[PDB]
């Protein structure tokens, strides 16, 4: 029974869901990736209110239930302000934690650099700082994939036949390899991704999909600015995550006091797979740093 209210911010409206943890111990703000996705796939974090960890959720500009701003502010440097415009409006000046998944992590970082003065901790779940790099690394992945698909992707990809059947064939199978491990996609996620393939964001600011990043984010690469981040931090990732662990390192590398912890036998939506123990680590990370 989380208060799913709405909030007008920067000319446009935004939806936000937070299940106020019984005994307020820490306020963790969530940051979904994509872009163009939604928070619906990060709901599993509910197991965190138990630890008296309050958890807020929110669909970024034009994402999910929230509305899109002028197409002019279709960037990451924008999403940032939002998070703040929102946060501030939510609890004025208070010690808050952040958790960006994938893109949201990148964002999370991006935000972390400027409005760092408003942070207690920063949890990243398979995030990134240099889009180009992430991409470069995915190819490798694709390459490793079995000829049949490794060949379909490059083929139809190098032509725009993204709709092509043989293409999707790889895609789904691929997703069941770097996005979601040994299993069946849960509701929370579905609706999320479904959103992306319906909103105007993931279409313009991202690209046809995850490994076909053609949107307004391929240039982005603030790997150097992250160095500036000095507040405590946490980074996670899977052995076979679409955003390969090799990316995570860098971050962990450019930022001290970080304790990169790769999840064994886990993919991207780690917060679901070994979710059972996933939360812990985060909570463990939070609590302690108080």
């Amino acid at each position: 029974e989380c208060i799913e209210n709405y909030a007008k911010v920067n000319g446009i409206y935004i939806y936000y869901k937070l299940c106020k943890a019984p005994e307020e111990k820490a306020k963790l703000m969530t940051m979904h990736g994509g872009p163009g996705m939604s928070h619906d796939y990060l709901l599993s974090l509910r197991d965190m209110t138990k630890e008296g960890i309050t958890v807020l959720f929110y669909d970024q500009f034009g994402c999910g239930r929230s509305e899109e701003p002028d197409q002019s502010k279709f960037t990451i440097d924008y999403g940032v302000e939002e998070a703040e415009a929102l946060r501030s409006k939510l609890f004025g000046n208070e010690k808050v934690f952040l958790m960006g998944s994938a893109y949201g992590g990148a964002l999370a970082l991006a935000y972390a650099v400027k409005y760092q003065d408003h942070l207690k901790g920063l949890i990243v779940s398979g995030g990134l700082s240099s889009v180009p790099l992430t991409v470069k690394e995915m190819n490798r992945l694709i390459d490793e994939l079995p000829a049949k698909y490794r060949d379909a992707i490059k083929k139809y990809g190098s032509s725009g036949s993204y709709e092509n059947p043989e293409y999707q064939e790889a895609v789904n199978y691929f997703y069941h390899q770097h996005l979601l491990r040994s299993e069946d996609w849960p509701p929370e996620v579905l609706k999320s991704l479904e959103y992306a393939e319906r909103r105007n964001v993931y279409r313009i600011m991202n690209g046809p999909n995850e490994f076909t990043i053609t949107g307004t984010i391929k240039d982005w690469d603030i790997t150097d600015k992250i160095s500036a981040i000095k507040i405590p931090t946490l980074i996670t990732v899977g052995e076979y995550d679409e955003v390969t662990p090799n990316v995570a390192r860098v971050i962990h590398e450019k930022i001290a006091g970080s304790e990169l912890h790769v999840f064994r036998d886990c993919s991207h939506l780690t917060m679901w797979e070994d979710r059972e123990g996933y939360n812990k680590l985060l909570s463990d990370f939070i609590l302690k740093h108080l």
Partner: peptide
């Protein structure tokens, strides 16, 4: 993103 896709699915089944």
């Amino acid at each position: 993103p896709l699915g089944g």
